[PDB]
């Protein structure tokens, strides 16, 4: 049984992306630990690494509004943060005119790939706008890895 | 150790999507070769195949602007190109009015799936607009396969 994780967002969290290890359809086993909102890899080897965030925003102050999602590695040795996977989305669009009330919008982002990882490596899935995090339903926000 | 690749875009490339085999967090091992911007599968079997492109465009001449991303197979025998994975996105929106200056936008696309491949099969991840390719930061553009 291979090192495996599939954690989800904390619904009872607070304009915050906080990974929860223990729910109904998640995984934290075979040596992978959740540690400071980071997945810690037990052994060395090839991992599939993936994540999805769903943003529900409201209003479009500008076309320049950006959503970001990024998975980063912190090697035990180096100890510095490196981006493995990363995407940016501009969800707007037009610009809500004023006197105009803001309308909701939905944007999902998905990241995923395979990487050679080292024992004791840390991994984090981070967004720029946790205030726009939507986890009002399950399956919408999640972070995972399996060793192959 | 299974046939594995995870190549990235050439930053020093030229309105071009050129796959680079040798960087810090990529993979080209166990028989997979990079050959004419195509991943060449060593043995037969089940592969996970995936890719992400990030487009940073500017201006919206029309609602009809399309971004495409597609992974295709070329079997040694047949020798003809077949689409395995394929998505299209319309990033606009409105139409920049004229006298109006163009504004930047970001659109990511992700493709990925598992397929039975044959020894000597070629695989390519192609976009329609390399002029809009954003790799100003790492983790933004990438192509990969692992044998399972």
């Amino acid at each position: 049984d291979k090192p495996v994780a599939h954690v989800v967002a904390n619904p009872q969290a607070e304009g915050q992306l906080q990974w929860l290890n223990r729910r109904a359809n998640a995984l934290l086993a075979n040596g992978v630990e959740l540690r400071d909102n980071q997945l810690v890899v037990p052994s060395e080897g090839l991992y599939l690494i993936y994540s999805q965030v769903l943003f529900k925003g409201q209003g479009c102050p500008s076309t320049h509004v950006l959503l970001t999602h990024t998975i980063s590695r912190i090697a035990v040795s180096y100890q510095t943060k490196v981006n493995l996977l990363s995407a940016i989305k501009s969800p707007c669009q037009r610009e809500t005119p004023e006197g105009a009330e803001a309308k909701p919008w939905y944007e999902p982002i998905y990241l995923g790939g395979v990487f050679q990882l080292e024992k004791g490596d840390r991994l984090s899935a981070e967004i720029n706008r946790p205030d726009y995090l939507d986890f009002a339903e399950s399956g919408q926000v999640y972070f995972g890895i399996i060793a192959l | 150790d299974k046939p594995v690749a995870h190549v990235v875009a050439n930053p020093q490339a030229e309105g071009q999507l050129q796959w680079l085999n040798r960087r810090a967090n990529a993979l080209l091992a166990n028989g997979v070769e990079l050959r004419d911007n195509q991943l060449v599968v060593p043995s037969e079997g089940l592969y996970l195949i995936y890719s992400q492109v990030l487009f940073k465009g500017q201006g919206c001449p029309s609602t009809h602007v399309l971004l495409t991303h597609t992974i295709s197979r070329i079997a040694v025998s047949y020798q003809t190109k077949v689409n395995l994975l394929s998505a299209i996105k319309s990033p606009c929106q409105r139409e920049t009015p004229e006298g109006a200056e163009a504004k930047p936008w970001y659109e990511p696309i992700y493709l990925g799936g598992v397929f039975q491949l044959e020894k000597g099969d070629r695989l390519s991840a192609e976009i329609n607009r390399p002029d809009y390719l954003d790799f100003a930061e790492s983790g933004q553009v990438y192509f990969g396969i692992i044998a399972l």
Partner: antibody
Amino acid sequence: EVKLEESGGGLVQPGGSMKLSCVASGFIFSNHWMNWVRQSPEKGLEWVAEIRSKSINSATHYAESVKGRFTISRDDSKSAVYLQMTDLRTEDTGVYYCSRNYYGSTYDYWGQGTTLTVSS
Amino acid sequence: DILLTQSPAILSVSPGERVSFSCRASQFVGSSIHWYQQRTNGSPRLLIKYASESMSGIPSRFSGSGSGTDFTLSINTVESEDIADYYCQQSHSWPFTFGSGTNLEVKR
């Protein structure tokens, strides 16, 4: 114009409570996100809390530094936003500004500030 | 929680000349940088939004630019009425943060 008027500052001992008030005119209040932003010479400008529109449910947001101590609320009927501060700290000392943030971007408008001095 | 550096903290310029304010983000913020003036005994006043778009009622002599992490506010033909502290703000990341501010002295 567009006016924001905050009030209710003054001296409190450490651990104390104090309620701040802000009355708005000159825009459709129920539409907009109201904020408190404080300023001190040591720390400069510091976002404190946001309360978004009805349409969002309230959607309240707090700075890490006041989480669980401060509570933001609004009375759309009165065009009012409130900051109820409890368990006050010396550091909480500063000028507190009522302010509108324009749908997650710019601080559109500012009141003229009200001063909190937390001290024995 | 993005950090904004405004160095130099003080600028001092003869009237008529052009002044430039620096704002640097510790990380990518796209163009979500906004600029404010704060006169003595005053509250902050929004000058420019999203790097370069000036608000209405704001004098033409104010402009901004920059993208990614390096940004600039510019006033040309500076005049004493411009004496203030100037702050930048990012809205790319939650929570929104401010720079420490640059002070403008117009010489005499």
